[PDB]
């Protein structure tokens, strides 16, 4: 069951405020006004939510997902999209996914890992820092469940 | 626009795990499994979410709401439901609302106050500690917006 | 806000007129002479007000309460006191309360349910038909509010 | 002894919802929240409670009163205030009273007549339909006694 | 260019003053205090502004719009919302729109027709008189332009 | 609360169409295209909106204002600007204001009087007919409130 | 006591398979997966279960009910919904009900008549063939009891 | 998804009406009154529902189950319980199950076979005709699904 | 005579893309669409145009100005606004101006210095880095003349 | 929106300084003194602005236009006017326009192409090098927009 939904405005997005690279659109989500982050083009693709471990219950397994959509204009996804949960000790749940040739214009949930706590910043995010242009990824929300 | 939804499982509820007083029900909320906290009866009514200030962006006004529903069986609401945001310094946004004779079986958003930052625990919650029995309040989510 | 107060004389009470089981006392209620129904002892405990739906406004949520007092001599309340609103179609808001170990000699409002109308008899009441003796309940009024 | 109190919200008041002519104010009446109907000015003065005969016990004489207050701003009462109980057969207990030069700011009970039953709508009310402006009548409650 | 903005208080709304069906909320509109008409529920949905033809210039084409918002609680809009301009000769610009499955929580301008004059009442409005319940339409203003 | 905004295009302005004396400029006003009337120079300064009394609700006090701006080039305002509401009976709410030495380049609302109805043309306007040149007054809108 | 429950998939529904007019939704009913028939809109409303008399015991009175729910979007029910049991000889138990202005979002059982046997098709159903659009009826099950 | 539930009263049970061998108990099943068939003891164990093929849709695969419970007093189940669907042509889907040493006091669904149609009696049932005593099987319902 | 006009979009503005501090508005400038940079509030006030020396003619004196407007809401200008032209060798034309108590709502041209060339980046700008809040400066254009 | 206006004095014009062929005239442009380049007659028609790529923002599409006017004395335009943007790599946006038989004495914007950057001279210009005499073209400004 879902503990937190966090919307991309609560995240840090490199070039997030620069309309050459990113855009925002107001939409309804089960009666709540949210803003989707809509990637036009960027090379330093980086989206991180920062939350404290004390926000979460200890001695219980959490899983985290990011809900996204590829547009008809999608390109540059022939590279590994790195998925990361950083715990307060400095350790990392590292995984990757390749978004190339997935169906456009449907929402899908990318799992970004699992964690358990036994106080301090937890980072949830995805990134690709390579010199190619990523285009046409829409971000809806980070979900944290237990 | 909505930055965080936090579901009652992420909160501390006095007698929350005791099926004499509280129950839980799995439902769908925009593709996501959540559990509604469904009050049968309690005298110490207390629900608190704990989040850290570093979860939030500075130099911007946040408002916080709690989405609830009264059942057909609702009673004991002829008392002030106290609403509280506690900031890290110990200071408090205190307000109250009276839920008696409201429409049952419709979701409504109780505003619990505003805050702005210029690091540390922020508490979002509602409570009534009086010796009467509160009955038939369903809790969906805490919403934090900016 | 309160639409109708109905005093126990306007109700049907099994054995109401039999001074072995029930008694009446004249008192003042806000400038108005009323008679409290004071249960000495009864096994068939049954109190019903009958009012017509056309007495009430449609497309609005009503709640109904019964104001009572337990005496120092109270006993037999370790049973479910059944609470009922019967609508004209035959359908029922069924709930219960247990009066055992409440404070004696203070007025309290028992909620007996909620209703909304979209013509015909509406019944408001409480009953316990078990073979034990209920003792020491004083009834002041049925309140109907919106 | 009092069988029913009915508050003006349960009644039909011509222009009742129109704040050019009528207003409402929340006050307490013996633990119960009621709304007083407070006439600012109206020419078609008409207040009617509708209750069914089956609400009442047969073979017993009922009397009905309306508790009102004139304000310091009272005027237009140099006309007959018509008092009426309409029985289900269509027949009417007609009387009148002149409110001019009465003490302001004290509650007084206007008797509006008597009835006995041996099923159907009973109307309790007062009216004046003349082209002058009635001002400064506050209505508390209809009382029905036996 | 805009000749008149007319706010819903200047209009006739069936059940407009009845808080079971309609509500009002004070908001700012470019320096000016206006009241939005916020439909909770009604079956006889009818909103008409009445203005005289002499208010308007002759031998010039006017267009008229009504600015509205659907809430997240919107329902009953799977029926034709009738749009009408009645000229003083009795003739009518009749059109309709279906509001079902539109984006909630965004203002949009419904065009209600065009007219040209070559003295007497002009009616601008929208209605649906069917026995279903319309819910969750907020009305900002009628605009008349030329 | 505001009932009608009327823009200067809906008014009669002596020499309004003559670009030696008056000019017009398209601007946005809360999403609505309006045209400001911008006085360059005129001696017969006269601006009148004509609306019918039946456009307005009876038994309620209306106030009317005209929102204007003086430019840096303002002059000839060392005379009384006459403010007038003409009612259908022929009677007039006459007031005046002196615009000399006010702050330029800020919008301010000139109150032009009050009226109540207990059918026919109502005129709202301002004028000065003296042989001097009035210069540099920009007109935004007539507001009618209740 | 209940002899058969028959779910709408076992019935014939005009336009049942056409998602412009009807939809289906999988839900749980006491451990059993059923599909509710959910009317969006249709003009030829017709739902018939066909069962043989030999399915049933002779010399005993059966009653049949259909359990339905009106949605918040309900409309077109200001017409008689015809209720019909056709026996093998061709004879019919004809009755009707009007669903307009009933509470939405609660299950209720429509009785569709009675039969007794002393071999061949029995039809249980409801229909309305008029040119208006029926909307927002959800069907759970036909119940046959004795 | 479930097409028909058929309760044991609709079936033929050898010695069903003889309280030495079988008993019945009224219980609630998702708001419907049903009677469980509760085997005390019998040697000729035989339960058959009879329905006509025309009750069912052709060219679609049906499966049938019987929901039962073994009591703490269960015995004699160390034999094959024969499961049978007889089609109208006379052909039979024959299978068996052994109920010995199953968990008592939990409902479980015995599959009794599959069928497809390309008019006439279909028999669904289970039997054991051996001379031993079967004891402590409770029958809830036959389910037919597609 | 004017050689180049450069509009604030062509410049770097600290917090320029952050709507907490800066905003943009589309306006017409002699038939050309430009965006005015409109300061709401900022502490690090910094605006720099970057152009290359090869953009300019050598052996001729250029002067540079910035056209701005203070709003009615202006504040924090009781500090020196630093004006700067940086030449490619690293040398700087430094001057300052105090904007406090200037006329609001009129465009004025701030001279930011002079330069002459005898290849490389030239920076034209104004800044104030002090910890107070600057508010209500609108920027139209940098002008370069010779 | 417009990023730069560049006036013909900032450009190189073959024979620009020779009053046999070209002339200059001081005029006002939105408060700014500019000089129009007014062609009397020339055979080598060539006008080039030189700006550096670092003057412009990367990863964004720019379009460039030249605003001109033909005089009543215009002639020699029965040839292709070549339009050119040269990028630093040496590559070219080549297009052409024919100015013969256009309206004289109105400003019009000739688009000269589009560019995007992913450091060095960018050339914007128009030319015709043929041996005929071009006459009566007035140049106002190069506009660069994004
Ligand atoms: C050269 C190549 O392979 N392709 C180019 C892209 O690399 C380039 O993207 C930009 O790359 C720079 C350099 O990595 C990014 O900035 C760096 O990354 C982070 C920003 O948070 C920071 O830690 C580094 O200091 C910073 N180094 C710099 C400024 O060089 C920059 O974010 C990328 N820009 C964008 C818009 O994504 C793109 C666009 O510049 O061009 C390709 O040709
Ligand atoms: C007697 C009466 O009228 N009311 C009874 C209620 O008081 C009682 O609810 C319990 O009340 C007690 C005292 O208010 C609660 O105790 C407190 O719990 C809080 C938070 O966990 C703790 O901080 C206090 O120190 C603690 N004080 C104690 C233990 O005395 C207790 O939580 C309430 N329990 C519930 C389930 O609401 C109920 C049931 O005990 O009966 C009423 O009749
Ligand atoms: C049996 C026992 O241990 N306790 C006795 C009580 O049962 C008994 O109360 C009386 O109970 C009967 C039946 O429960 C009540 O009679 C019923 O009355 C209602 C209408 O009032 C009618 O619908 C029923 O048919 C009728 N059933 C009968 C007569 O069998 C009766 O009201 C109860 N009386 C009182 C005063 O409550 C008490 C009192 O006699 O004695 C206990 O020992
Ligand atoms: C002119 C004068 O001396 N007095 C005016 C009043 O007559 C007038 O009061 C309004 O009078 C009309 C007519 O009596 C009322 O309309 C009546 O309303 C009733 C109830 O709904 C309805 O049954 C009648 O058919 C209807 N008569 C009609 C339609 O003519 C109206 O209710 C009165 N208004 C109020 C607010 O009481 C007032 C207001 O117009 O002005 C006096 O000057
Ligand atoms: C003479 C002086 O000092 N100032 C002159 C201004 O008076 C004059 O303005 C014009 O004045 C005339 C007379 O007041 C205006 O004409 C009047 O207009 C109204 C209708 O608008 C009409 O009912 C009157 O009959 C008419 N008066 C006449 C013609 O007798 C006229 O509108 C004014 N014009 C303007 C542009 O405001 C100006 C301009 O003529 O000149 C000054 O010298
Ligand atoms: C125009 C108007 O007022 N109402 C229209 C509706 O009538 C129409 O519903 C369709 O109506 C037709 C005619 O009644 C229905 O077809 C009929 O019904 C059965 C089919 O089971 C058949 O036995 C009849 O002969 C057949 N008559 C024909 C085909 O003419 C049809 O089922 C209705 N459609 C639906 C989806 O309910 C609707 C939609 O067509 O439009 C209204 O405007
Ligand atoms: C029965 C059904 O299908 N739905 C019910 C609705 O009919 C009903 O709303 C009320 O409906 C009537 C008629 O549509 C409306 O009465 C009319 O009011 C108008 C405007 O005042 C007037 O012109 C008509 O003369 C009058 N018709 C009558 C009285 O016969 C009435 O305004 C509606 N009320 C509301 C609140 O919208 C609603 C509520 O009763 O219930 C539905 O079930
Ligand atoms: C003797 C032994 O070992 N066991 C005894 C059981 O046989 C007996 O149960 C009864 O068995 C008979 C024969 O199996 C059953 O009669 C049969 O009933 C069917 C269906 O009606 C019918 O087709 C047969 O003709 C009939 N067979 C006959 C008459 O021979 C009978 O239904 C069984 N009864 C019960 C209650 O299950 C029991 C009880 O007599 O005793 C065992 O000792
Ligand atoms: C403390 C006080 O009275 N004033 C506060 C403002 O100073 C503060 O504005 C921010 O101030 C900081 C400190 O100078 C600025 O940070 C600097 O920004 C420049 C430009 O990017 C950067 O080069 C410096 O490294 C950086 N120093 C840091 C971060 O340590 C910052 O830009 C200012 N922000 C704004 C919006 O102007 C405001 C809120 O930011 O709070 C005042 O109370
Ligand atoms: C001869 C004819 O039919 N018409 C004559 C025009 O051709 C002539 O204009 C001059 O033309 C020459 C050649 O087109 C131009 O010279 C060129 O200038 C460019 C750059 O300015 C340079 O790259 C070339 O090297 C150079 N070519 C040479 C020198 O051969 C010259 O610019 C033109 N002059 C003008 C004023 O446009 C005119 C004027 O002499 O006379 C026509 O009759």
TrEMBL record, chains A, B, C, D, E, F, G, H, I, J:
<dbReference type="Pfam" id="PF14299">
    <property type="entry name" value="PP2"/>
</dbReference>
<dbReference type="GO" id="GO:0030246">
    <property type="term" value="F:carbohydrate binding"/>
</dbReference>
<protein>
    <submittedName>
        <fullName>17 kDa phloem lectin</fullName>
    </submittedName>
</protein>
<dbReference type="InterPro" id="IPR025886">
    <property type="entry name" value="PP2-like"/>
</dbReference>
<dbReference type="InterPro" id="IPR052147">
    <property type="entry name" value="PP2-like/Lectin"/>
</dbReference>
<keyword id="KW-0430">Lectin</keyword>
